[PDB]
Write an enzyme that holds these catalytic residues in place. Sequence first.
Site, mmCIF file in Angstrom:
data_model
loop_
_atom_site.group_PDB
_atom_site.id
_atom_site.type_symbol
_atom_site.label_atom_id
_atom_site.label_comp_id
_atom_site.label_asym_id
_atom_site.label_seq_id
_atom_site.Cartn_x
_atom_site.Cartn_y
_atom_site.Cartn_z
ATOM 1 N N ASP A 1 0.825 -1.274 0.000
ATOM 2 C CA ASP A 1 0.000 0.000 0.000
ATOM 3 C C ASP A 1 0.835 1.289 0.000
ATOM 4 O O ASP A 1 0.264 2.440 0.254
ATOM 5 C CB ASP A 1 -0.990 -0.015 1.143
ATOM 6 C CG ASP A 1 -0.298 -0.157 2.523
ATOM 7 O OD1 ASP A 1 0.922 0.196 2.613
ATOM 8 O OD2 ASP A 1 -1.031 -0.479 3.486
ATOM 9 N N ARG B 1 1.047 6.778 -0.044
ATOM 10 C CA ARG B 1 0.314 5.828 0.772
ATOM 11 C C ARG B 1 -1.118 5.730 0.205
ATOM 12 O O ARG B 1 -1.755 6.744 0.016
ATOM 13 C CB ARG B 1 0.272 6.319 2.230
ATOM 14 C CG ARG B 1 -0.527 5.370 3.139
ATOM 15 C CD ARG B 1 0.016 3.953 3.227
ATOM 16 N NE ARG B 1 -0.535 3.130 4.338
ATOM 17 C CZ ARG B 1 -1.756 2.599 4.348
ATOM 18 N NH1 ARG B 1 -2.546 2.729 3.282
ATOM 19 N NH2 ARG B 1 -2.213 1.896 5.387
ATOM 20 N N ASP C 1 -5.520 -1.048 3.911
ATOM 21 C CA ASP C 1 -4.420 -1.517 4.711
ATOM 22 C C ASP C 1 -4.058 -2.915 4.230
ATOM 23 O O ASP C 1 -4.821 -3.904 4.395
ATOM 24 C CB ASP C 1 -4.779 -1.517 6.175
ATOM 25 C CG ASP C 1 -3.576 -1.712 7.081
ATOM 26 O OD1 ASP C 1 -2.497 -1.209 6.831
ATOM 27 O OD2 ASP C 1 -3.764 -2.294 8.108
ATOM 28 N N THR C 2 -2.894 -2.986 3.678
ATOM 29 C CA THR C 2 -2.273 -4.277 3.411
ATOM 30 C C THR C 2 -1.457 -4.843 4.570
ATOM 31 O O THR C 2 -0.873 -4.140 5.345
ATOM 32 C CB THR C 2 -1.410 -4.157 2.131
ATOM 33 O OG1 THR C 2 -0.328 -3.188 2.280
ATOM 34 C CG2 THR C 2 -2.237 -3.934 0.892
ATOM 35 N N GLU D 1 1.840 -6.137 6.539
ATOM 36 C CA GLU D 1 3.237 -5.720 6.379
ATOM 37 C C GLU D 1 3.891 -6.912 5.722
ATOM 38 O O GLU D 1 3.342 -8.031 5.787
ATOM 39 C CB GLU D 1 3.919 -5.327 7.717
ATOM 40 C CG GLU D 1 3.309 -4.104 8.441
ATOM 41 C CD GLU D 1 3.389 -2.782 7.638
ATOM 42 O OE1 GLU D 1 4.442 -2.549 6.998
ATOM 43 O OE2 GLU D 1 2.396 -1.969 7.627
ATOM 44 N N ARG E 1 4.054 11.382 3.459
ATOM 45 C CA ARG E 1 3.625 10.526 2.330
ATOM 46 C C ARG E 1 2.419 11.146 1.713
ATOM 47 O O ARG E 1 1.545 11.630 2.435
ATOM 48 C CB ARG E 1 3.290 9.080 2.788
ATOM 49 C CG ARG E 1 4.414 8.360 3.514
ATOM 50 C CD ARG E 1 4.036 6.967 3.939
ATOM 51 N NE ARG E 1 2.919 6.980 4.871
ATOM 52 C CZ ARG E 1 2.454 5.925 5.511
ATOM 53 N NH1 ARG E 1 2.991 4.747 5.301
ATOM 54 N NH2 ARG E 1 1.404 6.052 6.300
HETATM 55 C C1 LIG Z 1 -3.873 5.750 4.990
HETATM 56 C C2 LIG Z 1 -3.506 6.759 6.012
HETATM 57 C C3 LIG Z 1 -2.512 6.500 6.964
HETATM 58 N N1 LIG Z 1 -2.185 7.438 7.864
HETATM 59 C C4 LIG Z 1 -1.245 7.248 8.930
HETATM 60 C C5 LIG Z 1 -2.051 6.774 10.156
HETATM 61 C C6 LIG Z 1 -1.173 5.786 10.825
HETATM 62 O O1 LIG Z 1 -0.475 6.415 11.977
HETATM 63 P P1 LIG Z 1 0.495 5.530 12.861
HETATM 64 O O2 LIG Z 1 1.773 5.372 12.078
HETATM 65 O O3 LIG Z 1 0.746 6.430 14.012
HETATM 66 O O4 LIG Z 1 -0.023 4.153 13.217
HETATM 67 C C7 LIG Z 1 -0.242 5.300 9.700
HETATM 68 C C8 LIG Z 1 -0.566 3.926 9.091
HETATM 69 O O5 LIG Z 1 0.150 3.737 7.867
HETATM 70 P P2 LIG Z 1 0.814 2.277 7.548
HETATM 71 O O6 LIG Z 1 -0.357 1.295 7.488
HETATM 72 O O7 LIG Z 1 1.557 2.624 6.249
HETATM 73 O O8 LIG Z 1 1.738 2.003 8.682
HETATM 74 O O9 LIG Z 1 -0.300 6.185 8.646
HETATM 75 C C9 LIG Z 1 -2.868 8.702 7.815
HETATM 76 O O10 LIG Z 1 -2.592 9.548 8.706
HETATM 77 N N2 LIG Z 1 -3.804 8.970 6.928
HETATM 78 C C10 LIG Z 1 -4.177 8.064 6.013
HETATM 79 O O11 LIG Z 1 -5.042 8.337 5.169
HETATM 80 CA CA LIG Z 2 0.101 -1.351 5.832
#
Ligand SMILES: Cc1cn([C@H]2C[C@H](OP(=O)(O)O)[C@@H](COP(=O)(O)O)O2)c(=O)[nH]c1=O
Ligand SMILES: [Ca+2]
Length: 129
Positions: free
Chosen positions: A15, A29, A34-35, A37, A75
């Site tokens: 993702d 992103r 959510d994929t 890891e 991102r």
């Molecule tokens: C998809 C997405 C992720 N994120 C942030 C929230 C999550 O915070 P935290 O890192 O504090 O858990 C994190 C999850 O992304 P990943 O699933 O790439 O880790 O990315 C956003 O803020 N907005 C979004 O639209």
């Molecule tokens: Ca992920």
Amino acid sequence: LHKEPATLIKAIDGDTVKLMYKGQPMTFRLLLVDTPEFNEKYGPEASAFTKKMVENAKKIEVEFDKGQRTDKYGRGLAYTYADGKMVNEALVRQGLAKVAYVYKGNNTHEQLLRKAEAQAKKEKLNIWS
Ligand SMILES: Cc1cn([C@H]2C[C@H](OP(=O)(O)O)[C@@H](COP(=O)(O)O)O2)c(=O)[nH]c1=O
Ligand SMILES: [Ca+2]
């Protein structure tokens, strides 16, 4: 919403992807998904799937939603398209991502992806197997 050009720099995982957007390198992103890891179950299959999709595309587009366009890690947050097919939806439809991270204002394609998740779950695909 509107589609904007971008070029693949490098696949990353299920993702996230590295794309050149308005001439700048950027990690994207994928909205609303959510994929797993890479180190989790279906993680490698999700990375593989996104990788093939974006590497094989002759045309990559990104579509920002109405809300934040960058997250807290800098991102980009977009719906990403490979020759007209949305990667975000494709992952969900194949059961390689869950609908996730649905935040008000950046959720235009929510019910399209939920519809895809319902069909992937119906089929018991991958994550839903
Ligand atoms: C998809 C997405 C992720 N994120 C942030 C929230 C999550 O915070 P935290 O890192 O504090 O858990 C994190 C999850 O992304 P990943 O699933 O790439 O880790 O990315 C956003 O803020 N907005 C979004 O639209
Ligand atoms: Ca992920």
